[PDB]
């Protein structure tokens, strides 16, 4: 994906699984979860953003 795009979450244990967030940054290092996605809805923890891998995220 790329920064600023709208993405659909495919992590089944995510609060926002199959919801739309937007990508803030993508790391270039050997990071296990580089895609940082921010979400309008807040989780039960109150967090509204999480880091995901590429294979857990699809452009819409």
């Amino acid at each position: 994906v790329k920064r600023g795009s709208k993405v659909r979450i495919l992590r089944k244990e995510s609060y926002w699984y199959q919801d739309i967030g937007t990508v803030a940054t993508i790391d270039t290092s050997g990071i296990r979860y580089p895609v940082v996605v921010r979400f309008e809805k807040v989780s039960y923890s109150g967090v509204n953003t999480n880091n995901f891998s590429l294979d857990e995220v699809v452009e819409v």
């Binding site: 089944k12 244990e13 609060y15 989780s43 039960y44 923890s45």
Partner: protein, 74 residues
Amino acid sequence: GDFLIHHAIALALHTTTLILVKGALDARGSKLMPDKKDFGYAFPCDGPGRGGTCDISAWDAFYLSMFWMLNTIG
């Protein structure tokens, strides 16, 4: 009177089923606790985080539906 009480029994059988079905279907996981299966059937809670997780186990929906069973057979 028979009509009204039969509808009351319908509410009771459906509500006990709701609690029990919610317990059975959400036994293995939920948005509140995705890995609920890893904790078993009867565990107390997942703690006060994520808003509060009291009576989140499938056993606890057995527990809550036992009152609704007693109410319906009542």
